Design an enzyme around this catalytic site. Sequence first.
Site, PDB file in Angstrom:
ATOM      1  N   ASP A 166       0.848  -1.195   0.000  1.00  0.00           N
ATOM      2  CA  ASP A 166       0.000   0.000   0.000  1.00  0.00           C
ATOM      3  C   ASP A 166       0.881   1.242   0.000  1.00  0.00           C
ATOM      4  O   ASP A 166       0.667   2.161   0.799  1.00  0.00           O
ATOM      5  CB  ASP A 166      -1.004  -0.031   1.173  1.00  0.00           C
ATOM      6  N   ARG A 170       0.165   8.983   1.287  1.00  0.00           N
ATOM      7  CA  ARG A 170      -0.565   8.929   2.569  1.00  0.00           C
ATOM      8  C   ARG A 170       0.123   7.986   3.591  1.00  0.00           C
ATOM      9  O   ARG A 170      -0.173   8.080   4.787  1.00  0.00           O
ATOM     10  CB  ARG A 170      -2.010   8.497   2.365  1.00  0.00           C
ATOM     11  N   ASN A 171       0.960   7.054   3.102  1.00  0.00           N
ATOM     12  CA  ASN A 171       1.728   6.119   3.938  1.00  0.00           C
ATOM     13  C   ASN A 171       3.212   6.497   4.052  1.00  0.00           C
ATOM     14  O   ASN A 171       4.069   5.654   4.364  1.00  0.00           O
ATOM     15  CB  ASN A 171       1.534   4.662   3.482  1.00  0.00           C
ATOM     16  N   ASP A 184       2.483   2.492   7.544  1.00  0.00           N
ATOM     17  CA  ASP A 184       1.376   1.734   6.966  1.00  0.00           C
ATOM     18  C   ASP A 184       0.217   1.865   7.953  1.00  0.00           C
ATOM     19  O   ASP A 184       0.150   1.110   8.924  1.00  0.00           O
ATOM     20  CB  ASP A 184       1.793   0.272   6.778  1.00  0.00           C
TER      21      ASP A 184
HETATM   22  C1  LIG Z   1       1.587  14.286  13.234  1.00  0.00           C
HETATM   23  O1  LIG Z   1       0.732  13.253  12.737  1.00  0.00           O
HETATM   24  C2  LIG Z   1       1.194  11.962  12.766  1.00  0.00           C
HETATM   25  C3  LIG Z   1       0.273  11.044  12.259  1.00  0.00           C
HETATM   26  C4  LIG Z   1       0.583   9.712  12.214  1.00  0.00           C
HETATM   27  C5  LIG Z   1       1.845   9.247  12.676  1.00  0.00           C
HETATM   28  C6  LIG Z   1       2.246   7.881  12.667  1.00  0.00           C
HETATM   29  O2  LIG Z   1       1.262   7.020  12.140  1.00  0.00           O
HETATM   30  C7  LIG Z   1       1.459   5.653  12.151  1.00  0.00           C
HETATM   31  C8  LIG Z   1       1.310   5.024  10.931  1.00  0.00           C
HETATM   32  N1  LIG Z   1       1.464   3.706  10.779  1.00  0.00           N
HETATM   33  C9  LIG Z   1       1.776   2.973  11.856  1.00  0.00           C
HETATM   34  C10 LIG Z   1       1.943   1.491  11.629  1.00  0.00           C
HETATM   35  C11 LIG Z   1       3.098   1.192  10.693  1.00  0.00           C
HETATM   36  O3  LIG Z   1       3.822   2.083  10.243  1.00  0.00           O
HETATM   37  N2  LIG Z   1       3.268  -0.120  10.396  1.00  0.00           N
HETATM   38  C12 LIG Z   1       4.168  -0.663   9.455  1.00  0.00           C
HETATM   39  C13 LIG Z   1       5.366  -0.021   9.140  1.00  0.00           C
HETATM   40  C14 LIG Z   1       6.246  -0.564   8.211  1.00  0.00           C
HETATM   41  C15 LIG Z   1       7.543   0.132   7.876  1.00  0.00           C
HETATM   42  C16 LIG Z   1       5.903  -1.763   7.600  1.00  0.00           C
HETATM   43  C17 LIG Z   1       4.716  -2.424   7.898  1.00  0.00           C
HETATM   44  C18 LIG Z   1       4.356  -3.718   7.206  1.00  0.00           C
HETATM   45  N3  LIG Z   1       3.467  -3.519   6.041  1.00  0.00           N
HETATM   46  C19 LIG Z   1       3.011  -4.794   5.495  1.00  0.00           C
HETATM   47  C20 LIG Z   1       4.125  -2.745   4.995  1.00  0.00           C
HETATM   48  C21 LIG Z   1       3.851  -1.863   8.830  1.00  0.00           C
HETATM   49  C22 LIG Z   1       1.942   3.538  13.126  1.00  0.00           C
HETATM   50  O4  LIG Z   1       2.253   2.672  14.134  1.00  0.00           O
HETATM   51  C23 LIG Z   1       2.308   3.198  15.466  1.00  0.00           C
HETATM   52  C24 LIG Z   1       1.779   4.901  13.277  1.00  0.00           C
HETATM   53  C25 LIG Z   1       3.500   7.521  13.126  1.00  0.00           C
HETATM   54  C26 LIG Z   1       4.330   8.529  13.609  1.00  0.00           C
HETATM   55  N4  LIG Z   1       4.013   9.815  13.657  1.00  0.00           N
HETATM   56  C27 LIG Z   1       2.775  10.188  13.188  1.00  0.00           C
HETATM   57  C28 LIG Z   1       2.432  11.561  13.225  1.00  0.00           C
END
Ligand SMILES: COc1ccc2c(Oc3cnc(CC(=O)Nc4cc(C)cc(CN(C)C)c4)c(OC)c3)ccnc2c1
Length: 305
Positions: A166, A170-171, A184
């Site tokens: 994905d 946005r990610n 993600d």
């Molecule tokens: C100021 O506003 C903001 C708004 C949002 C924020 C933020 O949102 C998040 C987004 N996503 C996730 C989960 C995630 O990244 N999981 C993930 C990561 C990777 C590298 C690979 C896979 C596996 N898949 C299959 C590809 C999963 C979060 O987990 C706590 C937080 C993080 C930090 N700061 C944020 C500041």
Amino acid sequence: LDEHCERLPYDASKWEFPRDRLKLGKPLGRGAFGQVIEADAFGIDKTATCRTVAVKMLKEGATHSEHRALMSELKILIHIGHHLNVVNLLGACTKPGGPLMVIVEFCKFGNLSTYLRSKRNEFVPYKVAPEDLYKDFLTLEHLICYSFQVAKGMEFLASRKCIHRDLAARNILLSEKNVVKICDFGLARDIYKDPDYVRKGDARLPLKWMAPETIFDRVYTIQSDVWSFGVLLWEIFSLGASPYPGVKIDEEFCRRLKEGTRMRAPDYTTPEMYQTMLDCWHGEPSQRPTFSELVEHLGNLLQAN
Ligand SMILES: COc1ccc2c(Oc3cnc(CC(=O)Nc4cc(C)cc(CN(C)C)c4)c(OC)c3)ccnc2c1
């Protein structure tokens, strides 16, 4: 390696963070079943140091199945490990008596699509005017730099035998000092409410970011992520616009794409960045550049710009 997460380890002695050392704050993103909340973590990564973090957890409506999915995501984040251009896992709360919480570093500026759209008016291709020197403007250099960093992060994911599925602006999150990190949101985005996800059978899929082999054959590989990366480049050099402007995303859009129809150059692109978009969008997956080749090419463009 991300298809069989349930066999991956969870080393509680390393990752387990006490729930009472977390001061939960305001929502950063909310889905139907999951959410991302800002929090203050006491001593999560530096002894006795308060740290702002982002915590992914479930919400009302979630079931045991989303709970299993969130545990798999924690396990894959552990397997992936750290890199500057991936959001870094800091800890987790998994002990009984409370919700499963996945804790990552906080990226102050949030998602890159919203950020670039908000800063669209404050863009100059080259900061060259003497009066414009102390203005915090986005330049071509910044856009190429964000592009290069996402390719570095994706190359890193690939080295860990993982794929994204994905990839989109946005990610991508923006932190301080112009650092971008791949994330993600998953369940922390409401895909049934989000216009970027379109009904295609019994699933809501990010059709505008998917390779023809993903749409038509349900094939997901690192090379289909390269296709998504090409779409991401278009989002960056359109400064956060939505892909395929004015196109109805139906059966006809999918056939035209499968036949070789592609997006036109976005308003802030350089000729070479658009050619890079076209290369990522090669109809044949093996003929697309790899992330390693994109890292080398973007690094060259960044040094030439
Ligand atoms: C100021 O506003 C903001 C708004 C949002 C924020 C933020 O949102 C998040 C987004 N996503 C996730 C989960 C995630 O990244 N999981 C993930 C990561 C990777 C590298 C690979 C896979 C596996 N898949 C299959 C590809 C999963 C979060 O987990 C706590 C937080 C993080 C930090 N700061 C944020 C500041």
